[PDB]
Scaffold this motif. Structure first.
Motif, PDB file in Angstrom:
ATOM      1  N   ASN A 122       0.690  -1.275   0.068  1.00  0.00           N
ATOM      2  CA  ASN A 122       0.116   0.070  -0.023  1.00  0.00           C
ATOM      3  C   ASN A 122       0.908   1.403  -0.053  1.00  0.00           C
ATOM      4  OD1 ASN A 122      -1.746  -2.257   1.702  1.00  0.00           O
ATOM      5  ND2 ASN A 122      -3.063  -1.097   0.403  1.00  0.00           N
ATOM      6  N   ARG A 167       0.978   3.983  -1.639  1.00  0.00           N
ATOM      7  CA  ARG A 167       0.133   5.347  -1.605  1.00  0.00           C
ATOM      8  C   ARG A 167      -0.485   5.756  -0.308  1.00  0.00           C
ATOM      9  NH1 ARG A 167      -2.414   5.598  -6.275  1.00  0.00           N
ATOM     10  NH2 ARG A 167      -1.601   3.419  -6.719  1.00  0.00           N
ATOM     11  N   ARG A 168      -0.555   4.911   0.858  1.00  0.00           N
ATOM     12  CA  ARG A 168      -0.866   5.097   2.178  1.00  0.00           C
ATOM     13  C   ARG A 168       0.315   5.095   3.162  1.00  0.00           C
ATOM     14  NH1 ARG A 168      -6.241   1.949   1.112  1.00  0.00           N
ATOM     15  NH2 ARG A 168      -5.640   0.535   2.857  1.00  0.00           N
ATOM     16  N   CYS A 169       1.265   4.225   2.752  1.00  0.00           N
ATOM     17  CA  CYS A 169       2.525   4.234   3.263  1.00  0.00           C
ATOM     18  C   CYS A 169       3.127   5.692   3.323  1.00  0.00           C
ATOM     19  CB  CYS A 169       3.488   3.016   2.754  1.00  0.00           C
ATOM     20  SG  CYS A 169       5.198   2.909   3.290  1.00  0.00           S
ATOM     21  N   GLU A 170       3.039   6.419   2.271  1.00  0.00           N
ATOM     22  CA  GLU A 170       3.851   7.887   2.206  1.00  0.00           C
ATOM     23  C   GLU A 170       3.021   8.713   3.154  1.00  0.00           C
ATOM     24  OE1 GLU A 170       5.071  11.137   0.508  1.00  0.00           O
ATOM     25  OE2 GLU A 170       5.867   9.049   0.605  1.00  0.00           O
ATOM     26  N   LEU A 171       1.709   8.540   3.140  1.00  0.00           N
ATOM     27  CA  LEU A 171       0.960   9.403   3.982  1.00  0.00           C
ATOM     28  C   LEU A 171       1.122   9.420   5.420  1.00  0.00           C
ATOM     29  CD1 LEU A 171      -2.479   9.085   2.104  1.00  0.00           C
ATOM     30  CD2 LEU A 171      -0.615  10.870   1.728  1.00  0.00           C
ATOM     31  N   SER A 172       1.601   8.119   6.079  1.00  0.00           N
ATOM     32  CA  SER A 172       1.937   7.714   7.121  1.00  0.00           C
ATOM     33  C   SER A 172       3.235   8.251   7.472  1.00  0.00           C
ATOM     34  CB  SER A 172       1.898   6.313   7.367  1.00  0.00           C
ATOM     35  OG  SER A 172       2.484   5.775   8.354  1.00  0.00           O
ATOM     36  N   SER A 211       3.444  12.056   8.136  1.00  0.00           N
ATOM     37  CA  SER A 211       3.350  12.570   9.590  1.00  0.00           C
ATOM     38  C   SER A 211       4.254  12.789  10.298  1.00  0.00           C
ATOM     39  CB  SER A 211       2.201  11.753  10.096  1.00  0.00           C
ATOM     40  OG  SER A 211       1.114  11.267   9.036  1.00  0.00           O
ATOM     41  N   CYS A 230       8.170   1.088  -0.385  1.00  0.00           N
ATOM     42  CA  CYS A 230       7.765  -0.317  -0.136  1.00  0.00           C
ATOM     43  C   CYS A 230       9.127  -1.043  -0.607  1.00  0.00           C
ATOM     44  CB  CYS A 230       6.738  -0.584  -1.163  1.00  0.00           C
ATOM     45  SG  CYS A 230       6.448  -2.494  -1.488  1.00  0.00           S
ATOM     46  N   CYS A 250       5.988  -2.106   4.113  1.00  0.00           N
ATOM     47  CA  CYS A 250       6.204  -0.428   4.201  1.00  0.00           C
ATOM     48  C   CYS A 250       7.546  -0.166   5.101  1.00  0.00           C
ATOM     49  CB  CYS A 250       4.816   0.183   4.537  1.00  0.00           C
ATOM     50  SG  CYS A 250       5.110   1.915   4.944  1.00  0.00           S
TER      51      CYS A 250
END
Length: 31
Positions: A4, A6-11, A14, A21, A26
């Motif tokens: 994932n 594209r969500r690993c990045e947003l995490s 933060s 990946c 991740c």
């Protein structure tokens, strides 16, 4: 399923970082 990025990045965003990946999992990166 794929990793994932594209969500690993947003995490990692933060923490102020980029996400990446490795295989099926991740991590964050200093890039």
């Amino acid at each position: 399923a794929f990793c994932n990025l594209r969500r690993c990045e947003l995490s990692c965003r933060s923490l102020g970082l980029l996400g990446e990946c490795i295989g099926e999992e991740c991590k964050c990166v200093p890039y």
